[PDB]
């Protein structure tokens, strides 16, 4: 498949399917093959990437949907990232 | 506008909670007022008596987060074919990451301290604008 | 059955899926397409254990109920710099801050 690179503020390079990243309108704008995020640390951006997989697997599905887990320690930062990324 | 039709035609239904939440069934009565019904614990079922044309929706009993019933917002009991009950499969939706984050932040921070959180003011309003059945009845209408 | 993985080396992390019945070698071919290094220059790991090319991901403990979309299983990756293989090194993610008083 076609992949894209999402880079966290601390230098972790997350490689995900283009389709998965294009779920975020912000990322689509930033691409129109790499994107640097100056404010999103790796412990938040990894969870963002896991959300893409979750959403694509469970959107339009009969199989029972599990809760998307978010630890209390990362919830505030993840909220801010989700607001920026619009997802 | 959104109200149950006073049909008086019985319809037997199974409320099946296939979610990790405690479920609050809400019946929209003949004047459109939401009536709360007893809760269903996670993974549990109740065989209940309702009627054809009646409107139901389903929420998290603690937080009022929206839930889906047969992949959609509203459930309306249909005709029982072969005497068998209609199944109401209550599930989690695929929440946005933003709304899921808001749920977790609401579960940890008490309403008084949303202002004290170091975030943009619009998120403070997103937190305070918590899920509410009256708002979604205006949305669905 | 689909299994959902994070393939990780140094500060690199690939999110992808594969079949439970697919092989370790076939996963190296996925890594090859993404990072442009052939299978012979790759070592794949479950924790400290080196994985054999012929074995299925299911045989190596990557099953659909442990390697989930919301919580994927980690596969370690190490490259051969010309002569010899580097040691397995996975840089940890950043640490979360303290919970603020309001959340604490
Ligand atoms: C004349 C008329 O239709 N009156 C309404 C108030 C009636 S009798 N309703 C409205 C809905 O169609 C359901 C029906 C009703 O109240 N049935 C009794 C009932 C009692 C408990 C429960 C529930 S919901 C979760 N757990 C239980 C035990 C469901 C139905």
Residue numbers in the entry:
A (entry chain B): 16 to 47, 58 to 112
B (entry chain C): 62 to 202
C (entry chain A): 1 to 104
What do the authors report?
Hydroxyproline is the key recognition element of small molecules targeting the von Hippel-Lindau (VHL) E3 ligase, which are of interest as probes of hypoxia signaling and ligands for PROTAC conjugation. The modified Hyp residue is crucial also for the recognition of the hypoxia inducible factor 1 alpha subunit (HIF-1α), the natural substrate of VHL. The new structures revealed that the noncovalent interaction network between the compounds and VHL residues was fully conserved and consistent with those observed with previous inhibitors.
The highest affinity compound 3, which bears a single thioamide conversion at the left-hand side, revealed comparable binding to the unmodified ligand 1, with only a small twofold loss in binding affinity, as measured by both techniques. The presence of the thioamide on the left-hand side of Hyp resulted in Tyr112 bending slightly to accommodate the bulkier group.
